[PDB]
Amino acid sequence: SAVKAARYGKDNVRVYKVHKDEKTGVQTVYEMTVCVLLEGEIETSYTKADNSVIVATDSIKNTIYITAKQNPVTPPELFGSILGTHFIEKYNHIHAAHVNIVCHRWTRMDIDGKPHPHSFIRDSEEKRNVQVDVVEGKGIDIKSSLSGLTVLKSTNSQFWGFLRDEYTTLKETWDRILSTDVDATWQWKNFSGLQEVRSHVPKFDATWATAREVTLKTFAEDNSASVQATMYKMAEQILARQQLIETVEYSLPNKHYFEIDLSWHKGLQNTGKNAEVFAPQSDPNGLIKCTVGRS
Amino acid sequence: SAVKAARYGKDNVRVYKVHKDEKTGVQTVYEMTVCVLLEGEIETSYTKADNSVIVATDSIKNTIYITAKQNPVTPPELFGSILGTHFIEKYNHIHAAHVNIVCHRWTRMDIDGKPHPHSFIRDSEEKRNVQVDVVEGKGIDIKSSLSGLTVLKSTNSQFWGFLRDEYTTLKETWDRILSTDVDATWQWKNFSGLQEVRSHVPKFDATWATAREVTLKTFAEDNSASVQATMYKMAEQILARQQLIETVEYSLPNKHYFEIDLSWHKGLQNTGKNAEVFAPQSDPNGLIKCTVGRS
Amino acid sequence: SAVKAARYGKDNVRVYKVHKDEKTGVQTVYEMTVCVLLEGEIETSYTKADNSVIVATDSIKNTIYITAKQNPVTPPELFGSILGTHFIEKYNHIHAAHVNIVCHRWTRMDIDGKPHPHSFIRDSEEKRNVQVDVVEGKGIDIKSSLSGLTVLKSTNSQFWGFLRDEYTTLKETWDRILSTDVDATWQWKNFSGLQEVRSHVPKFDATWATAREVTLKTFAEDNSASVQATMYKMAEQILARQQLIETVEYSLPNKHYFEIDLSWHKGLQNTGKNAEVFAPQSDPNGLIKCTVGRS
Amino acid sequence: SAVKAARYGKDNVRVYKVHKDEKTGVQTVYEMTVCVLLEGEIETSYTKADNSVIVATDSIKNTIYITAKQNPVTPPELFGSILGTHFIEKYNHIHAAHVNIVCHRWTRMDIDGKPHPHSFIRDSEEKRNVQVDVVEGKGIDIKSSLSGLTVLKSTNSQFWGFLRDEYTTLKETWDRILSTDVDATWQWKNFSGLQEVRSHVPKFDATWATAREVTLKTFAEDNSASVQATMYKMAEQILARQQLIETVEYSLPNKHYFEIDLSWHKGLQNTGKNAEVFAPQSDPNGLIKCTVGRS
Ligand SMILES: O=c1[nH]c(=O)c2nn[nH]c2[nH]1
Ligand SMILES: O=c1[nH]c(=O)c2nn[nH]c2[nH]1
Ligand SMILES: O=c1[nH]c(=O)c2nn[nH]c2[nH]1
Ligand SMILES: O=c1[nH]c(=O)c2nn[nH]c2[nH]1
Ligand SMILES: [Ar]
Ligand SMILES: [Ar]
Ligand SMILES: [Ar]
Ligand SMILES: [Ar]
Ligand code: NA
Ligand code: NA
Ligand code: NA
Ligand code: NA
């Protein structure tokens, strides 16, 4: 037997950082969950019980807190690139670092119409994520994402003209509920190293904001022919607005809301045009994916 | 052996309702999870296998959807009172109905600064809940609550002057992070029946909004001496603003953020005045409760 | 305003303890999650910012680890009673301690048909729980429970003869699937104090084992007329076997498995006697409770 | 813009099947959660709102229940291969089916030392999984796995001789707790099609049982030098026992149990040789992976 692939490190490292402006008194908080996995010349830890090649996972955890102390933690694309670069520069035998960051929302509170200097609310479990792969001699590959964005529209969704055969019971419809949890990933052009990531820093927050805005507006305004057709329109607009993105990937569940036939009870009308009360279905769910790139 | 207490019914009934304004084209959605448990002269179903006394839980589920079709589902205090009253009026041998409703957020989307007519976002897992107990000859008891409101302040929290003995390691502090998940319940005066609940309908949404606003403002502005002292100030203000509330109960976890001593690494200063990077603790957590009523 | 009720303490305290037999080399592990909440003369911490009455929740956490170091942690009824008694004896102004313990399974591994001296497996998320209320001058009240015991029988469950009216769609059946998650609680006679709890120590593990065995055998062997009727038979047998129990409470969800009509597809027969493939329903679920006590 | 990749289908399809032996009266239940995603000539559903290429996800769901009615559902490697093959044979424009199955435990109850004919218990959240990729002209690729197997050993784990630098605080140890949740995957040789999968049917259950037994015995008996070294010994033995496996992948969290220094309290000794009470850590956790293949 041989080791074909190996990676190890620390998962679920919770980090909070506060920035205090001495001038204004305004405080800004950042909270993330970090995972760092390393690869390199470590096979002998598996095959020969040779721990001399292991950077302890406890040390990786210490490194994350030290790196957060000495560097900006925003945008997460930059923090992840700094953290990944650290390992491949510090350790001769480590050739790849894989950094995953989940950013949690702490939104400044408005009290009496004024932004509060040091009070925050978690307005939704929506996340902003980054996956950073730092590979010796191959640069920095960054995938940015938003996830956990849960939306619903109560009309202006259709689904008709699909394949009908002896397995088909679904009725065609010209008016349904559409609800999903949005997972959207944009993959950046390969960066040569940290200097190039630093040169593009302003584009990271702006592209996240554009991806979010395009997703919400397209969902709200599209008279949707299908999840497939609406998600393609989203991906096409993101690629049009940011030339440094190579691909956009959406993964969308179709969270079903079923009509309830109440006609058995006193002829109550609750289907088609008369549908008011629906049963949200926990499972099963449609799952629709696509990856859109340049011609 | 004897049956000392018995209740049964249907839990986890998901309901969606849409309201369509024909004039404006504007649609409003409501989504809830409902539980109905009944009590009454049902002991023989347990002791003698006498199913003749059982209103099937499947029928309770049907009743919830029919009631939602024929009645307003907002405010939830009113819907729960209608649903509970139904069972004790329809079934001679049912003497109490217990209705629990969890209301899920569907917040209208703003697209290009305008409210969208039919598109919604789940802005946070915060819930608005109601517990309604309808008891034959004893009226309607309503407990209203908000839950899952997650907040953090990065300064203006203290904790000193507590009991110190041979079990104590905690250092006194004049500047810490305070973060909690707010669970707040207000208990209404007993109502004689549905006519009296209907007479107070406007107070339900207004009191929920006041409870939320008082919680957020007091949390943000109090230079907190303890969770205990801040939560009492919240409860006292709610009771002052709504005379039809008898009691206010808060249940608050103290979600700890620990300083990280980095002085072992190149004398890095990250404690006290120099604290920037903290470790959020998943467990354990402080849990602080109180119930505040009138003199 | 006045404080009507107040309790505070530490939740989610994870504890592991190992016992090492020097003779045999055999090791036994215990893992629990503990919550301790205190009550007493503490109103001024809420009303006057008087922290002098507060035993810090951090100190409660330290106390749990010290108590586990110096005492047996099994049976949990005894450990909880020791821990609760500690607070009301140590602190003059604390008059009640509320101790909740969840015990996690670590079952010794069998390797090559022999019990392993120091290797364990988590065989199911079933828990053994205790709730201990220690109240100055009122003794020790103990509720013991098992929870998370998930069972299914594929036949020998019926449900017919229930109330039928204009809300009813459910068909009567003489052969269905019955599946539940068992939550069973037995409430002990009030104990005068720790000496009396110690005098009954052997009864705690034996009664837990009897409750489990009676639940499993009755579920498996009863040709069930309803959840109501089967759960009553369980409670009646537990009360018959342990005279120091006052009440037994069961809380049982009815986890529905629905027939799937496939007759639309090539006349496939999959209902009634021909039912082979079913759709487990995640929600909604029946919820059936009862409390059984002595004549 | 262009579609670079697309797949869609139905997730979270819960299925139960019962087998009834008329001779013996013995019933056997199977419960799974199924996901089917399709790929093929479907780009126009995304780009042109052309639904004519879409096999509705609702139809995929119907197909899973019909396939379960007409075929064995065990071993899951066979069921997944039948289900995947169906789509690429039935639909000219579908060129790949991706089938994921999670099998839930329903273990026959022993009542009074005898196996019960129709009563089952969920003994742990351990799963048996299959991933089946059926690709037109490329055969059937099967990955089998077990997941959610949670184990702990209280001694006979060491970790010393790792890299020490200015980021390192971890002390070397010759005696620690080791606890993990095992995720183990074995990848079969490519199969030409369903006839070849059928020819190997007996090997699927036997290899699952061998993988489980090797994992448990190696964990229990290895005087572990590291997670890395113990997991390699597991993978090497599985590959030795089944020639039709190409690779074995383990993914193991290192679930930390920390010593608690109690020496501040009356000189209590609870570290090193005197360690009895530990604090299980929920996060962070080590994460160790490896893939082992043939020379
Ligand atoms: O078994 C282990 N492997 C590691 O890589 C490691 N790092 N810290 N502790 C550890 N334990
Ligand atoms: O056992 C049951 N009890 C009930 O109360 C019930 N109601 N519907 N189905 C049911 N099954
Ligand atoms: O606000 C607080 N209240 C308490 O009771 C406490 N105990 N430890 N820390 C604490 N903080
Ligand atoms: O938008 C949809 N896409 C699909 O692929 C589908 N299948 N069933 N319903 C559906 N809705
Ligand atoms: Ar969509
Ligand atoms: Ar608070
Ligand atoms: Ar039952
Ligand atoms: Ar291991
Ligand atoms: Na390197
Ligand atoms: Na009545
Ligand atoms: Na006392
Ligand atoms: Na094909």
- Main sheet specs of chain A: 8 strands, antiparallel
Gross CATH architecture of chain A: Roll
Quaternary state reads homotetramer
Order of helices and strands of chain A: EEHHHEEEEEEHHHEEEE
In angstroms, what separates the terminal alpha carbons of chain A?
43 Å
* CATH-defined superfamily of chain A: Urate Oxidase
Residues in helix, % of chain A: 25-40%
Largest interface: A-D, 73 and 73 residues
Strand line-up in the sheet with most strands of chain A:
1-2-3-6-7-8-9-12
Shape of chain A: globular
Query: Number of DSSP helices of chain A?
Result: 6
CATH class of chain A: Alpha Beta
Ions, cofactors and other bound molecules: 8-azaxanthine, argon, sodium ion
Q: Structurally, how many domains make up the residues of chain A?
A: 1
User: Radius of gyration of chain A in whole Å, from Cα?
Assistant: 24 Å
InterPro entries (chains A, B, C, D): Uricase, Uricase_CS
Enzyme class (chains A, B, C, D): oxidoreductase
Binding site for 5-hydroxyisourate (chains A, B, C, D): 57-58, 159, 176, 227-228, 254
EC number (chains A, B, C, D): 1.7.3.3
